């Protein structure tokens, strides 16, 4: 009799940690990504400074 | 004169003709000032002060 019902409930936790295996394999992809942006647009954001060559000049109406 | 190189590294020693003759008009007893802009480096600039005078060739020391 036993061995009838360890195999219901063997099913079921199978089923809970493979749904959980892809969960938790999705999101894991998501975090990967977010973390990736952020280097690139810290390294853009230093380079992109700007210089002031020669006088200033005046002009007078 | 051999190649088409146009480098300016040691050794080498080349003069600049700005020719302003009907399109701007300088005169005696003037201040006028030339503006250098190389791409990278110091940034210069020349004052000097026309003469009294004008002869066929002026120096301005």
């Known amino acids: ?61 | 004169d051999t190649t088409g190189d146009t480098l300016l590294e040691q050794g080498e020693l080349a003069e600049i003709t700005v020719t302003l003759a009907p399109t701007i008009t300088l005169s005696t007893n003037t201040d006028f000032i030339i503006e250098v802009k190389p791409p990278a480096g110091a940034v210069f600039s020349i004052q000097r002060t026309t003469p009294a005078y004008i002869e066929t060739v002026n120096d301005l020391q």
């Open chain 1, 1 to 61: 009799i036993t061995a009838l019902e360890t195999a219901i409930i063997l099913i079921a936790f199978v089923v809970v940690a493979s749904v959980f295996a892809f969960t938790i394999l999705s999101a894991g992809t998501f975090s990967t990504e977010r973390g990736k942006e952020a280097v690139y647009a810290g390294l853009s954001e230093v380079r992109s400074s700007i210089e002031i060559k020669g006088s200033v000049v005046i002009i007078g109406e």
